[PDB]
């Protein structure tokens, strides 16, 4: 409870840790610690009744977040580990189930079968892109195919739990935590032309309530970098 | 010089042979190894994780997220089949496109057990009770609440726990995993009633496969 780090402090009270290994460190690279390790709290999304799902690309939503947006831009190469906190707060009269999963190398397919989706559609800068509950049309030029039952990658949506995941069951459970190591082939890769992770949240059992409660449930997501290292003389 | 003799089967090419081969590019000094996390060394490791079963197909909720959600509401009749599905191997059943099913469509012989982990996703104030009857193969499907209690079964409270795990063998009638209403759903006021149920499938890490083949889910 009341974990403190850097100059920002949040409060917790069961954590699933990646593929078993705790994130650790290794021209000459530098290891900055005093100006980066802080809990960057993203802005909160609203979970309506007929919602679909959201995603964030992980070394892209931290591109405007203060000092980290300089250390990504001044240092092209880099390698980091992450720590995610997702908690949605509601009463005892709400109901629903979330699936929080953190997929590595999440390639998405365009709507048109011959093109590829543009950059401003794959990753909103520190903002949640949203899934849809219908099909994305064919007549548009460059837009991401975001049918929720296939999760954008052309896979069965129920089979996504092979990745590091966690269930949020609003009847009993309340929060989820992930710890993700740096999973890439090349040890020091460019951070601008690469999105090595993707944090998805899909509602399986949709939100339901009675008349009189609040008609939305807010979800807050908090990311915290770890093992941040860059390249530069 | 040294006398030899060529046996038959000498200038032939077998598709599944293993002989030492000449390299095309020597002196390449190949890029070394790295401890990348998350290594798999046996394909049964994929089958141990849990995956959601699309048990609510009914030709209309197939292309949506209502395929995984079983509707449960407080009706007026006491005792009706909530859901039910057979366990026929491979013949278009509901366990076909899950993660356990997509590996076991590569082999022809397999024999072992299955964890069917359930989960009630409703409100935190609602109670109820459910029967989870498994019928052994050869015996008929139970058409009543009473004889389902006579078979092997497990009563599932909702207020105490929210997940009751059932173990069942599965071979290459064949069985039914039907589920019956024991009581209604007691709710307080200002709480909705139409709660849903998720279902998971797994491997009980105790079955082997033989005689590899290809899958039929391709052109």
């Amino acid at each position, epitope marked *: 409870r009341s974990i403190t780090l850097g100059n920002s402090t949040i409060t917790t009270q069961n954590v699933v840790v990646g593929y078993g290994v705790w994130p650790e460190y290794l021209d000459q690279p530098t290891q900055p610690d005093v100006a980066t390790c802080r809990f960057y709290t993203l802005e909160s999304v609203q979970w309506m*009744k007929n919602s*679909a799902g959201w995603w964030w690309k992980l070394p892209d939503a931290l591109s405007q977040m203060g000092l980290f947006g300089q250390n990504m831009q001044y240092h092209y190469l880099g390698r980091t580990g992450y720590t995610i906190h997702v908690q949605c707060n509601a009463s005892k009269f709400h109901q629903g189930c979330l699936l929080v999963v953190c997929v590595p190398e999440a390639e998405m397919g365009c709507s048109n079968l011959n093109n590829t989706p543009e950059f401003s559609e794959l990753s909103g800068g520190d903002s949640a892109r949203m899934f849809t509950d219908t*099909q994305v049309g064919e*007549s*548009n030029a460059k837009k991401v195919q975001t049918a929720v039952w296939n999760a954008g990658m052309g896979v069965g949506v129920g089979n996504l739990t092979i990745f590091p995941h966690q269930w949020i069951n609003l009847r009993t459970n309340n929060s989820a935590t992930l710890v993700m190591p740096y999973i890439n082939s090349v040890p020091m890769d460019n951070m601008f032309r690469h999105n090595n992770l993707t944090l998805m949240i899909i509602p399986f059992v949709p939100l339901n309530y009675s008349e009189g409660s609040s008609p939305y449930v807010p979800i807050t997501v908090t990311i915290a970098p770890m093992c941040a290292e860059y390249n530069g003389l | 010089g040294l006398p030899v003799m060529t046996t038959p089967g000498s200038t032939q090419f077998l598709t599944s042979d293993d002989f030492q081969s000449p390299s095309a590019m020597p002196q390449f000094d190949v890029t070394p190894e790295m401890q990348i996390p998350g290594r798999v060394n046996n394909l049964m490791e994929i089958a141990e994780v849990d995956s959601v079963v699309p048990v609510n197909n009914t030709e*209309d*909720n*197939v292309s*949506s997220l209502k395929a995984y959600q079983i509707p449960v509401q407080s009706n007026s009749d006491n005792g009706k089949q909530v859901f039910g599905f057979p366990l026929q191997p491979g013949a278009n059943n509901v366990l076909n496109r899950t993660l356990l099913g997509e590996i076991l469509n590569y082999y022809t012989h397999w024999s072992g057990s299955i964890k069917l982990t359930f989960m009630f996703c409703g409100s935190a104030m609602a109670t109820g009770k459910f029967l989870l009857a498994y019928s052994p193969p050869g015996a008929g499907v139970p058409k009543n609440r009473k004889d389902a209690m006579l078979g092997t079964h497990v009563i599932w409270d909702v207020g105490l726990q929210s997940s009751c795990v059932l173990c069942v063998p599965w071979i290459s009638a064949a069985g039914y995993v039907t589920c019956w209403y024991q009581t209604n759903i007691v709710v307080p006021a200002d709480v909705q009633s139409s709660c849903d149920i998720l279902c998971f499938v797994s491997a009980c890490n105790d079955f082997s496969v033989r005689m590899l083949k290809d899958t039929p889910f391709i052109r």
Partner: antibody
Amino acid sequence: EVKLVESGGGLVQPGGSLSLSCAASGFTFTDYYMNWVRQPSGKALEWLGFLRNKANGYTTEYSASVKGRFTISRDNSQSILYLQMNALRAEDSATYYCARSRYYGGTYRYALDYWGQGTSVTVS
Amino acid sequence: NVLTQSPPIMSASPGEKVTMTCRASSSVSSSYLHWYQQKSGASPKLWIYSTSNLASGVPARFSGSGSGTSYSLTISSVEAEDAATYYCQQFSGYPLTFGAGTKLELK
């Protein structure tokens, strides 16, 4: 009870523009999909394109033949709908309706249950 | 995808069993085909959705069936108020294409 009234029909020269307006009453506007179907006089129906609700991020999907020349946009303040027309031709002489779509079970079927009265747009 | 309704012109006396068909150029799903009814210069109204489920506020005589690429609709008895037009709608992909039309006049 739903009651969708639409206005803005009348004379327009070819090569110009036109802006229709379709008002909504009897429901919360940010929970139902809004469609637009034109019908030529005595001919088969053709669907133009729709607009999603607040929970889907307010996106649009037009048809293939009429993409670009039109634009579906909503107002955030009141339960009202706009339809921008640009560079009309002589063959868009039809009447324009206002349709609503809703969920039947828990999924999304593609039917349009409740329709407006229909305003008539002709060209010269 | 196009929809070949057949036939466009029918007339019927009160009391008979009348069928109309909707045949698709491809294999359209049973959950993506609906029926409408439009009176003489009036607003069109949904009649049957998803090929088996009646709408709200319709009599119980109308029922439809069919699967694959051909779908049909069956009325028990011809009455006095149901001489109008009919259309079937489909969705396998975009665009949403409509049918040719079934015009019905009383006898």
